[PDB]
Chains A and B, each alone.
With several copies, the nearest count.
Chain A
Amino acid sequence: AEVTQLSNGIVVATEHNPSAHTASVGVVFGSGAANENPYNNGVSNLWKNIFLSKENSAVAAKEGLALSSNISRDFQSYIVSSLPGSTDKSLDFLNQSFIQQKANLLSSSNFEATKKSVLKQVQDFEENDHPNRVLEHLHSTAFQNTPLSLPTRGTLESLENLVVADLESFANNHFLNSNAVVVGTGNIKHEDLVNSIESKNLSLQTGTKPVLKKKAAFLGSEVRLRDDTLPKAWISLAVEGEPVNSPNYFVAKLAAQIFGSYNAFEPASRLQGIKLLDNIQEYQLCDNFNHFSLSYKDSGLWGFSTATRNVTMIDDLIHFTLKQWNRLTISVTDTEVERAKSLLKLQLGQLYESGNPVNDANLLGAEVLIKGSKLSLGEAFKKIDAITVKDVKAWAGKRLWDQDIAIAGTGQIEGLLDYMRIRSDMSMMRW
């Protein structure tokens, strides 16, 4: 399905969907918040809001175009959406506003206003979005003193000292042909997109991105942000996981699907075939939880997140969930593996067939920027169907059984026990 060409230093990747009603083109760079430093943290967040500023969007609206941008730890993207008969109109807008003529966007009275608004978005996030700011501190403590520990939005102190010359420095080092992929998804054709870049002579700078010194290194630790005025307790807990291109990439995702997610107020979520629900529903230990498997270029995280109002029984919630992780290493049934196989395929099928061309562009560019190509959905289903119980036991034995953990929490967390008490629950003396 997907086609990738290297006509020049830039790479062109596409995904033709003839039964769609929109098209999207854009550029994805192989740099994110992991390519900054504590003192300029949030520069890549400021660049996203410059692309989506009022003056830039007014020009695109008059032509019937919509702008989208996303910042991650390993990549950032700038997308333009349009009707199927106006693909060359979007390529021209991307060229004249981003690839070249970037000084008018970076003008004064536009940098100042955009900077003032981003400072407000960051302050609100740090005071209202408790479940998401806890997951950001989990990265901060698991990979402390490392590129992989910097928040994707920046901090109030990095942004407050950012100045006029700081944004131009970053784009020189990172917005280059060797660091970029041009992506077209929706009702577009590979031949029609390549024939348009070769005519307009589109090209970025011809440098090379700097090479970092350190690498990602997991360290067992914890950070606690207690706040007795909040009504709940939010907690995140994880061990070291798998990076992308790991052989055990789908085993770790299947292992997270065995315990899944839960919502106390949804009647159908209380009937799921998860044995953990039998210990936590009698006394209402939590309101919701979800298990994840995050994968980056160098490392990853594997764990779960919870929000609860039962502040006097937090230890029971942590004790019971970790004792269920113990069964992956020693005793996990065939039915649990077969059920998780069917729910992982459904979950992946929804993510890669959402029908939104903007979502597909982000997933396509990020995959090509690392692996060089993109694995087919049918090929992924074959690998998922081949996992056995012996593969789960081997994986969990080396990653989960008696291993260090990282913990982050906020709210009413007086009932969360010490590190060593929680750490000692990662195995058991009975086996």
Chain B
Amino acid sequence: LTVSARDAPTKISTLAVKVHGGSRYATKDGVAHLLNRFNFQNTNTRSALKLVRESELLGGTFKSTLDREYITLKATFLKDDLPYYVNALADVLYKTAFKPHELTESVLPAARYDYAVAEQCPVKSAEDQLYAITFRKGLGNPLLYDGVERVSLQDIKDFADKVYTKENLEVSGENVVEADLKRFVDESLLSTLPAGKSLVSKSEPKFFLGEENRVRFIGDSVAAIGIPVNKASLAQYEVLANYLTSALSELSGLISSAKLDKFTDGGLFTLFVRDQDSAVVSSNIKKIVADLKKGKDLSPAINYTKLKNAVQNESVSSPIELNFDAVKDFKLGKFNYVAVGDVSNLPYLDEL
């Protein structure tokens, strides 16, 4: 239970509760997706309809977001309504009803829509494949629920009790008086949560290199590569991501996207090539991997990376401080590869 906030002369405030309950901690496939969609339903003292109607007359909104590390509950509101939204967030983590009719009428249909709009994007399918073959169990767990493994109402109840503990969440606010937030959190239902254990481990995640996978798909073709990154190399691959997409590189016109996803214990580097013609995709990926195997000079991109890092760390309240000053060169070694689309006309790993 760590509480922190920053003040400002501003009319709008934000409050977030971050829980280490993402898909990498899920006991069953999609159990974290179902708990995320179950968040702001009826509680034991208040209904979902009453919460929406009352909050609208006060000027506020609610949102729940899921990624591979966190489940986040967010409230945006007017500045003077702070004590109302502290109790509202505390009630969600404490006394959710978990009614059987709420799963079939509102929670399951919502999860079907999220899965339907993500199975149509070949880039999202390729990224999940890269996570699966790099890390097998854990960070490689599926993100969304698709019904392959049967998840029941009792499983969602059990998962919530495991992750909604006093030692597994952090409270942060924007444009909030820090002294006032601590008093409101202290006397709310958050202080009476069970004191469980932190689910985050201090070790490094086991990874695999040299893997491959192909998926048939009707639509655009996608080719992608993936590189696991440890803690010491995080700054080197952050410059590489910004150098490849910017105008400093001749390869920028062939690369659809490129990014580094950073965790507490490491990260993963991803690069995507996507086009409607399979011949274009085949020629581009071969030229990209041949140029990176020779080497690059990532010095002219340090200042550009420093500005881009500060842009995306403006909202994040706990950004790890990277150096970027000791980054000189890059040389491609071993990597994972995934092809999605017209796989009978796309290259294999041994041909790259």
Contact = CB atoms under 8 A, between A and B. Distances in A.
Interface string A399-420: 0000000000000000000000
Nearest to B63: A268
Contact of B314 (A22, A66, A346): A22
A19 interface: yes
B12 interface: yes
A193 B52 CA distance: 46
Given A272-B56, A338-B57, A22 B311 contact: yes
Contact of A377 (B6, B11, B301, B304): B11
Nearest to A338: B57
Nearest to A53: B247
Contacts of A267: 41, 48, 106, 110
Given A61-B304, A83-B306, A342-B56, A349 B314 contact: no
A266 B40 CA distance: 12
Given A265-B113, A268-B40, A61 B246 contact: yes
B53 A353 contact: no
Interface in B60-119: 60-62, 76-78, 106, 110, 113
B58 interface: yes
A378 B12 CA distance: 12
Interface in B286-326: 300-301, 303-304, 306-308, 310-311, 313-315
Contact of A345 (B53, B78, B247, B314): B78
B110 A353 contact: no
Nearest to A264: B113
B203 interface: no
A349 B12 CA distance: 6
B57 A378 contact: no
Nearest to A60: B247
B79 to A, nearest CB: 9
Nearest to A274: B56
B10 interface: yes
Interface string B235-273: 000000000001110000000000000000000000000
Nearest to B77: A346
A180 B10 CA distance: 29
A356 to B, nearest CB: 8
A350 B48 CA distance: 24
A102 to B, nearest CB: 19
Contact of A339 (B57, B62, B304, B308): B57
B310 A83 contact: yes
Contact of A62 (B6, B8, B61, B248): B248
Interface in A57-103: 57-58, 61-66, 81-83
Given A57-B247, A346-B12, A64 B303 contact: yes
B307 A81 contact: yes
Nearest to A344: B59
Interface in A260-277: 265-268, 271-273
Contacts, number: 96
Nearest to A1: B9
A349 B40 CA distance: 24
A378 B11 contact: yes
B247 A61 contact: yes
Interface in A221-266: 265-266
Given A83-B306, A346-B76, A350-B76, A268 B246 contact: no
Given A22-B310, A342-B59, A350-B12, A58 B248 contact: yes
Contacts of A353: 10-12
Interface in B31-56: 40-41, 48-49, 52-53, 56
Contacts of B52: 268, 271-273
B110 A265 contact: yes
Contacts of B78: 342, 345-346, 349
B104 to A, nearest CB: 13
Contact of B49 (A19, A265, A271, A350): A271
A65 B246 contact: no
A271 B53 CA distance: 8
A381 B59 CA distance: 13
B103 to A, nearest CB: 12
Interface string B1-42: 000001010111000000000000000000000000000110
Nearest to A63: B303
A343 B57 CA distance: 8
A66 B308 contact: yes
A81 B52 CA distance: 39
A421 interface: no
Nearest to A67: B247
A346 B61 contact: yes
Nearest to A56: B247
Contacts of A66: 304, 307-308, 311
A205 B313 CA distance: 39
A372 interface: no
Interface string B124-159: 000000000000000000000000000000000000
Contacts of B59: 342-343, 345-346
A273 B301 CA distance: 51
Contacts of B113: 265
Contacts of B61: 346
B48 A271 contact: yes
Given A22-B311, A62-B300, A267-B106, A349 B11 contact: yes
A207 interface: no
Contact of A65 (B8, B62, B307): B307
A355 interface: yes
9 contacts: A19-B8, A20-B314, A22-B310, A22-B314, A61-B246, A64-B304, A346-B77, A350-B12, A381-B11
The 6 residue pairs across chains A and B that have the minimum distance between CB atoms: A64-B303, A342-B59, A57-B247, A349-B12, A271-B52, A346-B59
